[PDB]
């Protein structure tokens, strides 16, 4: 099968600036009828893919002409003259000149925005959960940028690494930030054996880490 290679694997562009993605095929995509069947798709977060361009450079309807495609033989490029917040997502090139049809690996386009520090929140276990003998301590780290962040759990000053469940959202198109959830689960009896719980976030927006914490005492 024809291998389709895309580069870069990921790109961070600021709104208003140009961008371009490259796609390389292992074999010429020039068909014997003189047509080159290379298309470009975009798949926005939580959506089905959707073509933007067919036959190397023809644009589909409903598509703004900020997007242009070009290339020939084995080399192709998608160019965005001016990036908008809506461009966020995964881009793919596909070839239909050779059977079976093969897709490129994908290129994630992320919007580069000004650095934003996380708003951190901490929650103790719910009475309802404790009643089942379990205890989950949750920490939300919302609306931050860049995406690289590090959170540490500490029980009475010591670092706990086992029992952590993290989850990150994808970049929000509305504000270009990411959010993250970190849940530390323990048994009810182990929970009641400690005093302070802390969630620490290390992120580029500061040299001293954000710390949200609570003491379980009584009442």
């Amino acid at each position: 099968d024809i291998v389709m290679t895309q580069s870069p694997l990921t790109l961070s562009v600021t709104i208003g600036q140009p961008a371009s993605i490259s796609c390389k095929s292992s074999q010429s995509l020039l068909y014997s009828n003189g047509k080159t069947y290379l298309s470009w798709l975009l798949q926005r977060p939580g959506q089905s893919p959707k073509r933007l361009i067919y036959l190397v450079s023809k644009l589909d309807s409903g598509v703004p002409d900020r997007f242009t495609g070009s290339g020939s033989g084995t080399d192709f490029t998608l160019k965005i003259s001016r990036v908008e917040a809506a461009d966020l997502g995964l881009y793919y090139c596909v070839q239909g000149t050779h059977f079976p049809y093969t897709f490129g690996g994908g290129t994630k386009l992320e919007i580069l925005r000004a650095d934003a520090a996380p708003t951190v929140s901490i929650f103790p276990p719910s009475s309802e959960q404790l009643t089942s003998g379990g205890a989950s301590v949750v920490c939300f780290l919302n609306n931050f940028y860049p995406k690289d962040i590090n959170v540490k759990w500490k029980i009475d000053g010591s670092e706990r690494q086992n029992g952590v469940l993290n989850s990150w959202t994808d970049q929000d198109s509305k504000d270009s930030t990411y959010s993250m959830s970190s849940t530390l689960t323990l048994t009810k009896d182990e929970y009641e054996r400690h005093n302070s719980y802390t969630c620490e976030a290390t992120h580029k927006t500061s040299t001293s880490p954000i710390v949200k914490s609570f003491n379980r005492n009584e009442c």
Binding site: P49, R51, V94, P100, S121, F123, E128, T169, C199, K212
Partner: protein, 222 residues
């Protein structure tokens, strides 16, 4: 108006078979090729096969020969894809697509995609989730705004549907992607409202898990 309506998410046992449907509307069914595409959580797209409902003529990617079987029902305008000998690596989202390439013309018409059918191949059993309210004790924001949460844990299979106040509360909410741990999922969501809204008024987390016929509502109280 072209619409490709795909069947619901499926929980299937290994070795078993699934028949996925793609009901179409708004165009002459027998006139266009329907393609099937696979997407496995790895930003990867793979072409499986295509069928011309007018003649029943089908083309298969050799990787899927034997595995997939396309059929089309001209009366109901529904295309189908049967997957057999399922194994865990077959778990993914499968799309039916009215791609738009007209062979005779060698030109294109707009592509229309189905919403996708997520297939989970597992022998894990269906499990209802436990829904816990998350009200602040220290981490909160406190002054000006406050953030509440909802923890949905221990369920199988995906998906679960989570809303706040039936969906009337949509701004300021972040629902985090479910994470599977030991054949069970965990999902959480946060909602930030002003200090004047809550506790003054009611804020509930609505959780639904159709796989288990579960529908629970948890009010976030101080």
């Amino acid at each position: 108006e072209v619409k490709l309506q795909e069947s619901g998410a499926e929980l299937v046992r290994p070795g078993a078979s699934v028949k996925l449907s793609c009901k179409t509307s708004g165009y002459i069914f027998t006139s266009y090729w329907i393609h099937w595409v696979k997407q496995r959580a790895a930003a990867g797209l793979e072409w499986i096969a295509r069928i011309y409902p007018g003649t029943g003529s089908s083309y298969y990617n050799v990787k899927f020969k034997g595995k997939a079987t396309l059929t089309a029902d001209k009366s109901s305008s529904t295309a189908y894809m049967q997957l057999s000998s399922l194994k865990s690596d077959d778990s993914a989202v499968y799309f039916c697509v009215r791609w738009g390439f007209i062979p005779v013309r060698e030109d294109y018409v707009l592509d229309y995609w189905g919403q996708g059918t997520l297939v989970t191949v597992s022998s894990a059993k269906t499990t209802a989730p436990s829904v816990y309210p998350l009200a602040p004790v220290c981490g909160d924001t406190t002054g000006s705004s406050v953030t509440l949460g909802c923890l949905v844990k221990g369920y199988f299979p995906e998906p679960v549907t989570l809303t706040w106040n039936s969906g009337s509360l949509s701004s300021g909410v972040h629902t985090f992607p479910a994470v599977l741990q030991s054949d069970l999922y965990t999902l959480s969501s946060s909602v930030t409202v002003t200090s004047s809204t809550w506790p003054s008024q009611s804020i509930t987390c609505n959780v639904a898990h159709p796989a288990s016929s579960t529908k629970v509502d948890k009010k976030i109280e101080p």
